[PDB]
């Protein structure tokens, strides 16, 4: 089942419960993968988290390129760029006006049983 924009669906609100919501847009989110200098691996960096070069302006680093990364703790780490992969996601709006950007697997059609 493809999900299309304008479709009523069911997904989890920010309060953690399933509600009907409406798909307002199909977006593409690009995630970066890097190997930190200590060998730990991240698969979901945003391009703007690369702080050794301007990837929002000039695209991803070359594969294997040395980079510095601003992590979710606000600190900067050395790493090496592994890959980038774009992911189709679904911007949904709930009855209260709140919105989320979610993965295909987190969206359910009205006809289907919920987990």
Residue numbers in the entry: 897 to 1011
Sentences from the paper on this structure:
KDM4 (JMJD2) is a conserved iron (II)-dependent jumonji-domain demethylase subfamily that is essential during development. Vertebrate KDM4A–C proteins contain a conserved double tudor domain (DTD) and a potential zinc-finger domain at the carboxy terminus. From our biochemical and structural profiling, we find KDM4A, KDM4B and KDM4C DTDs display different histone-binding preferences. We show that these DTDs use an aromatic cage as a general mechanism to coordinate trimethyl lysine and, most importantly, the sequence specificity is largely determined by side-chain interactions with surrounding residues.
In all the structures, KDM4A-DTD forms two lobes (HTD-1 and HTD-2; HTD, hybrid tudor domain) with interweaving β-strands. KDM4A-DTD, which displayed strong binding to H3K23me3 as well, also bound H3K4me3 and H4K20me3, consistent with previous findings. KDM4A-DTD binds H3K23me3 peptide at low micromolar affinity (Kd=2.2 μM), slightly stronger than its interaction with H3K4me3 and H4K20me3, and KDM4C-DTD displayed highly specific binding to H3K4me3 (Kd=6.8 μM).
